[PDB]
C-alpha cells in the first residue's frame, strides 16, 4: 500500500484505468480514501471533514464509490 | 506461554531455517523465516579488511531487482574498489610513467654523451 | 592443509593472451605480499626469484628444485629444506647439487629452482605434546596415525 | 505467596548463611561486580572531565588508579578528587605568589637598568 500526500496525485490516480473501485472509511478524526489499482492500494488520509466532503463530489462517475461501514 | 512450531517440513535448526518471532493481528506469536544476511562487496585490491560503502549489503540474486545507483557509487572503480586504493592506484599509475619518462631522458643523455 | 610449507598465489601476466595467470608457488622464508617475484634466465640472484641452476653461482641456497627440466619443481620442497649447488660443468651442461638428505646428485643445468629456504622451518623443534595434536596433525593429511605394533 | 516472600527478600530476609546453596561467585559474580564498578567510576571521571572539574592529566592518572583497584566505590574517589583539588589549589597559589615575586624582581631590575642607561 502507498499513502498519497497530495490531492492532485490522488485524483490522477483515481483517473487511471487500473482503478477498480474507491472506498471511504470514516472513522474518528480521520477520513480514508482508498483506491484499488492493479498493483497497489493507494490511500489518502484527510483530517478535515469539509475537505473530505469536497473531495467526495470530485470523484469520477465511472469509478465505483463505496462508503464502507 | 505460547509454545509454537515450525511451518515447514525441515525440522532441523539449519542455516536455511533461521527464524524470528512475530506477533500477528490475531494476537498470537508465530515464526517469520528470516532472509539470510548478505554482505557488502570487498575491494578488488584485497589489502583493505573493510568492505565498500554506498552499496546495499544483500544476497546476490537480489541485485537483479536493485537499481543501478544502488549497486555501485558514482566514481572510477565505483562499487569495486575503495577510494583510498583508487587514489593510490592513480598516484602509482602517474609516478611509474613519470619514472619511465625520467629513464628515457637519462637514456637520451647517455646516447648524447656516448 | 596437510603441509608445513605455506603457499603463495603469484599472479603472472601472460605474454601471448590478455589474461592474468595465477600460480601456487612454495613461499620461501622472507617473501612478503606485494613483492615482484621474477622468473626466467636473465633474472637476478635474490630471495623470491626462480632462475636456472646453470646461471646461479657456487654455494647458492635454493629450494623447490627440479630433478628434470620441465616438471615444475620436485626436489627439496618440504618445510625448512634446501639443496645446495656444489659445482658446475660447462661441457654436457651438468651440475652437482647436494640434497637435504645429504646425497650428491648430478642434475642438468637447464632446470630451475626458487632461491632460499622453505618457510615454516623448525617445525619439528616443538614436541607434539598429546594425542589430540597428533590426531589433528594426521587427520588433515591421511589415515596413518593409529600405529599398532 | 511469592509476593509476600519477595517483600521479605527485599527487606533482607530468607537470605542468611543457611538458605544459601551457591557460592558468592555463583550468586553475585565478582566479574559483574568489577563491571558495575568500572561502569560507575569511568563515567564518574568522564562527567568530572566534561564538566571542566578535573583536567586531562589527573583524569588519566585517576583512570589508571581506577583500573588498578585503588577505590572500592564512588565516595572515597570523590574525597580523593577533592583532596587533590585542595593540594593543587595550595600548590598553584604558592606558585603564583612565587611567580609574582619573581616578576616584580625582574621588572624592578629592568627599571633599574633603564634608569642606569638613561643617566649614563
Amino acid at each position: 500500500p502507498r499513502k498519497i500526500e497530495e490531492i492532485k496525485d490522488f485524483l490522477l490516480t483515481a483517473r487511471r484505468k487500473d482503478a477498480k473501485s474507491v472506498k471511504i472509511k470514516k472513522n474518528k478524526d480521520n477520513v480514508k480514501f482508498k483506491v484499488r489499482c492493479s498493483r497497489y492500494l493507494y490511500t489518502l488520509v484527510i483530517t478535515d471533514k469539509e475537505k473530505a466532503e469536497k473531495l467526495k463530489q470530485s470523484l469520477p462517475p465511472g469509478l465505483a464509490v463505496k462508503e464502507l461501514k | 506461554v505460547q509454545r509454537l512450531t515450525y511451518r515447514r517440513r525441515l525440522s532441523y535448526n539449519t542455516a536455511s531455517n533461521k527464524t524470528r518471532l512475530s506477533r500477528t493481528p490475531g494476537n498470537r506469536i508465530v515464526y517469520l523465516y528470516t532472509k539470510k544476511v548478505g554482505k557488502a562487496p570487498k575491494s578488488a585490491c584485497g589489502v583493505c579488511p573493510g568492505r565498500l560503502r554506498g552499496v546495499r549489503a544483500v544476497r546476490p540474486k537480489v541485485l537483479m531487482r536493485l537499481s543501478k545507483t544502488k549497486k555501485h557509487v558514482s566514481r572510477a572503480y565505483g562499487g569495486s574498489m575503495c577510494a583510498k586504493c583508487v587514489r593510490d592506484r592513480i598516484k602509482r599509475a602517474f609516478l611509474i610513467e613519470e619514472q619511465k619518462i625520467v629513464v628515457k631522458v637519462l637514456k637520451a643523455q647517455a646516447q648524447s654523451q656516448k | 592443509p596437510g603441509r608445513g610449507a605455506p603457499l603463495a598465489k603469484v599472479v603472472f601476466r601472460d605474454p601471448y593472451r590478455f589474461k592474468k595467470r595465477t600460480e601456487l608457488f612454495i613461499a620461501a622464508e622472507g617473501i612478503h605480499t606485494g613483492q615482484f617475484v621474477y622468473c626466467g634466465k636473465k633474472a637476478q640472484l635474490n630471495i623470491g626469484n626462480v632462475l636456472p641452476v646453470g646461471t646461479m653461482p657456487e654455494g647458492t641456497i635454493v629450494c623447490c628444485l627440479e630433478e628434470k627440466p620441465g616438471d615444475r619443481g620436485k626436489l627439496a620442497r618440504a618445510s625448512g629444506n634446501y639443496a645446495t649447488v656444489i659445482s658446475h660443468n660447462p661441457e654436457t651442461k651438468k651440475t652437482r647439487v647436494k640434497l637435504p638428505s645429504g646425497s650428491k646428485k648430478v642434475i642438468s643445468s637447464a632446470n630451475r629452482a626458487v632461491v632460499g629456504v622453505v618457510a615454516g622451518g623448525g617445525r619439528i623443534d616443538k614436541p607434539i605434546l598429546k594425542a589430540g595434536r597428533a590426531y589433528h596433525k594426521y587427520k588433515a593429511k591421511r589415515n596413518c596415525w593409529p600405529r599398532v605394533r | 505467596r511469592c509476593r509476600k516472600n519477595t517483600l521479605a527478600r527485599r527487606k533482607g530476609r530468607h537470605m542468611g548463611i543457611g538458605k544459601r546453596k551457591g557460592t558468592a561467585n555463583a550468586r553475585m559474580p565478582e566479574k559483574v561486580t568489577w563491571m558495575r564498578r568500572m561502569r560507575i567510576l569511568r563515567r564518574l571521571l568522564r562527567r568530572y572531565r566534561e564538566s571542566k572539574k578535573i583536567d586531562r592529566h589527573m583524569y588519566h592518572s585517576l583512570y589508571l588508579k581506577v583500573k588498578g583497584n585503588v577505590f572500592k566505590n564512588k565516595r572515597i574517589l570523590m574525597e580523593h578528587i577533592h583532596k587533590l583539588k585542595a593540594d593543587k589549589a595550595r600548590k598553584k597559589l604558592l606558585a603564583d605568589q612565587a611567580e609574582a615575586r619573581r616578576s616584580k624582581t625582574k621588572e624592578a631590575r629592568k627599571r633599574r637598568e633603564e634608569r642606569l642607561q638613561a643617566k649614563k
Partner: protein, 91 residues
C-alpha cells in the same frame, strides 16, 4: 603479581606431559605468541596466523617467515650468503 615461580605459558598444561618437555615447549610457545615489530610499518603487530605465515595488523601485509618465529637464524645466514653471491656476481 607474580603467580607461578618458574612455569609460564605451560601452566595451562598443569602437571601433565613432563617437566623437560614443558620446558622445551615453553620457549617456542612464548615465541609464537610474542607480537613482533613489523619491518614495514614499525608497529608491534606481527601475529602468527599458521605455520610459516605471519600477518601485520596495520599494513595487512602477510610475510612468509619461520614456523614458530619470524626470522630463523638459518634463513638470516642464507639471506647473507645470497646477498654476498649477488654482490660477487654484480661486482
Amino acid at each position: 603479581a607474580k603467580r607461578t615461580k618458574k612455569v609460564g605459558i605451560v601452566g595451562k598444561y598443569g602437571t601433565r606431559y613432563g617437566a623437560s618437555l614443558r620446558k622445551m615447549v615453553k620457549k617456542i610457545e612464548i615465541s609464537q605468541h610474542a607480537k613482533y615489530t613489523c619491518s614495514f610499518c614499525g608497529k608491534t603487530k606481527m601475529k602468527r596466523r599458521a605455520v610459516g605465515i605471519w600477518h601485520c595488523g596495520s599494513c595487512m601485509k602477510t610475510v612468509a617467515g619461520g614456523a614458530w618465529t619470524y626470522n630463523t637464524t638459518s634463513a638470516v645466514t642464507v639471506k647473507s650468503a645470497i646477498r654476498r653471491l649477488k654482490e660477487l656476481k654484480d661486482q
